[model samples]
Target: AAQTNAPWGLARISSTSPGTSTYYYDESAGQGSCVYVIDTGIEASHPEFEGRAQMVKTYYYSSRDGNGHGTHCAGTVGSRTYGVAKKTQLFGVKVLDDNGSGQYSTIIAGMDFVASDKNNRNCPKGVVASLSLGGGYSSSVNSAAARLQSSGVMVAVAAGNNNADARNYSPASEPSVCTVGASDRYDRRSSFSNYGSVLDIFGPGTDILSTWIGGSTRSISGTSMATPHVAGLAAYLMTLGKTTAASACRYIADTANKGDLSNIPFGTVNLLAYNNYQA
Candidate 1:
C-alpha cells in the first residue's frame, strides 16, 4: 500500500460517481487514436478494459509490474472503457518493475524507443508519450525529450509528489515537456503536489479508482493518477485531429477550466482558451 500512496500522501480520489458509468461515457467513446504509456506493464485483461485496449509494444527493463505501480498508472491512462482514453491504443514500455523503481538509464532508453520508433511504419506516427514518474531535474533527459518533441512526440510528465516547487524534477521541470501537477476535485492543489511556473497544467489526482493486478479494482492516489487524465485528454484531442503533442498540450492547457487564480500557486493559466483555435 505504501507504493500506492507514496506519491501523494492521501487516499486515492474516489470516482466522481459511484457505480455510475458517467466517467466512462463522458470521456471515452471508442474514439479513433492511440497514445504511448511509458511505464510498467498493464493488466491488459481487466473487465473494464476487455476488448477496449491494445498493446502496440512491451518492454521488460524492470521485470513486469513487480510493484504494481506501473499497472495502476497504466489503468488510469487507458485501462479499457474505464480509462480516460479507452479507445486509444497503448504502447506499453516497462521501464520500471515491481519495486516501483527504475534507473534513469532504463527510463531514458524507453524515451529513446519512443523517439526512434514513433514513425517507423510499424508503430503509430506522432504518438504522445505519457510519463507518470519523476526525480531530480536532469538536463540530459530534458534534451532527450526535446529531441522527441522535434520528432513530433508529445511528452507528458508528472511534476512530482514532493509538494515543493516544480523545480524538483526532471522532464517535468523541463519547459519543453508538458509538466502536470495534481489537483483535487475542488481544483485545489493537493498537499503533496509540486507546483511552480514550470507547471503546465493540473488534473484530477485524489482517491481515484483504477485496475489492479488480478482484474480487481482498487482506490489509489497521487500525481501519478493525475498525469494520465491529461494523457487521455491528449488522445481525445488527437482524435479530433490535434495530432502534434504541442498542439495537444496547448489544447488541454487552454481548455482546462480555469480555477481561482488566487488559490493556485502559479496563478491561473487558461487552458480552455486553446480549444477555441480553429485548427
Candidate 2:
C-alpha cells in the first residue's frame, strides 16, 4: 500500500508517487502562473516559497499579514511540497483582518485589484484567484466575481464551513465562482461542509497539512483548506492553454465527471486527479 490521497494525494497527481498506479505531473507544474490568494495574508519570505511568493495588493492590513489561514491556503496552491503548481508566482492579497473577518466591500475591492492587472501582472489571464474567505450573501461581491470571471480571472471559493446551504453565502452562492466543499480521505464529505445544488466540487479538507506563516507547517481543516487545491489545478490548466474562466469551469466539470476521481461519490463532485487530466 502507498499514499493514495494529504501527503497521500501526491501519489495520484504527482511524480512523487510511491506506488505503481501510474501517475504524472501536470504540464505546467508552476512555470508562468499567477495565483492570487485573497485571505488574511502570506509570510512571503517563508522557506517553502524559496522567495517566489509575493503580494498583488493588500486591503485591510497594510503590512500584509496577521492570520495564518492565508499562508496555509497558499501552500496548498503553490508550495513545492503541498501545492499543485509548484513554480507559480504566488501572490498574497489580504482582505481579511486579524480575526479572519472582512467586509463584503473590502473583498470586492481585493477582486478589483487582481482584475485590474495593475502593472500588467499575469492577472485576468491565465490567472486564478484563490479566495478562501467570505461573508453573508452580497450581490455586490457576486457581481464583482462574475465580472472578473468574464474578464478572464477564474475564482475558486469556499462553500463555507457552516454546513448549510451554500446559497446562503456570498461567493459560495456566486454562480460564476467555483464553490468547493470539504471531503475526507475516504471520499466522504466533511460534516461541516455546506452542500447544495450550488456546490461545484469536493476536495481534501480534513486534517490538511500545509506551510504556515513564520516558516513552519501545520494542519487545519475547512472548505477554506479545500479551495486552493482546485484553484491550483485550475491555474495550472490555464497555463497549458486549456480554457478561460468560463470554459475552465466547463472543463473542470467534465473532468470531474469523467472518472478523474475514481471511487469518488457520484451525484456530488469530482475529487480531482491531475494524473487523469488531459493536458
Candidate 3:
C-alpha cells in the first residue's frame, strides 16, 4: 500500500491491528461530515474518488489545473481511496484554477461559501477546511480567517515551503488559523518548511504519496502536503467530541510530542502525546 509522511497514520495502524481497529476506524464514517477544500477542483469521476467526493461549489477564478498542484493537494486530503478523511464530504473551491494562483479576494469568497449555509446545507459543520496554498502574510487574509473562526469553522493552512524563520505566508500566519508546518517521516522538521513564532504544529510533508490527476500517482515534497494531516486530525477530533476549533486545536496542542523541540527551532509539536491521549 502507498503511504504519506504525515503523523496521522493511526488509520493505517487500525487497519493492520484488529485489536486497535476500532480506535481509528475512519472516525468520520456516517457522520455526514463535510470539509471545504479551497484549491483546484478534484477530478470528480476518478475511480479512486467516485462516490467519495461531492463538489458542492466550484469557482474558476484562475486558469484550470495547468500544473496539477492543486489537484494533487486535494487528493491527499479527500480522495476516497487514499485520503485521511475519506468518508467526509469534499467541497472543491476552484480559487486557484489551473495556474496554481489566485487573488486573496477570490480565496476569501470560497471561504465565505463554506462559512455560510445560505445555499448549501453541505457547508462545513464542525468540519475542517484545508488550504494547501500560501503567500506572504497579509492582514486581509488574517482578518478573513478570524471571521471564519468566529463562525465555528477551523482552518488548516500550509506554512510556506520556504525554509525561513520569518512569517512566510498569510492565513497560516493568522492567529485564528492552525498553521501547519512540515516534518519528515523521522519526525524532524523538513528542510523546506518555514519556521516561526506563528507556527502552531507540524505534520508529515516530505515524500508524500497521494492520488494525482489522470488516474496517476505521484510523490511531492512541501509543507503543503503536511497541512491536510492536521485538517484530517481536526475532523477526527471533532468526531471524538471536540466540536469547536479552539477545543480541537487545544486537543492537538495538549497531546503533541513536546520533546521534539530540542533541535527544532519552532519548538516540538507534541504528536506522540496528542495521539496517545486520543487513543
| Best prediction by lDDT | 2
TM-score of 3: 0.82
Residue 18: error of model 2 in Å? 14
Global lDDT of each model? 0.64, 0.74, 0.65
**Clash counts for all predictions:** 19, 2, 12
Query: What is the C-alpha lDDT profile of model 2 across 96-190, one tens digit per residue?
Result: 88778887888888888888863488443477888887778888888988877777777888989886788889888988778888766555577
- Total clashes for model 2: 2
Per-candidate TM equals: 0.81, 0.86, 0.82
Candidate 1 accuracy as lDDT:
0.64
RMSD of 1: 6.4
Q: How do the residues 211-278 of candidate 1 rate in per-residue lDDT, one tens digit apiece?
A: 77776777777888778877766766676565456677766775555643225654434221112222
Model 1 ranges off by over 4 Å: 1-21, 24-30, 51-63, 121-126, 260-262, 266-279
- Each candidate: RMSD: 6.4, 3.9, 4.5
lDDT per residue (tens digit) for residues 120-207 in model 3: 4553446678888878878888788777767777788887888875364788788768888887655567888887887778776877
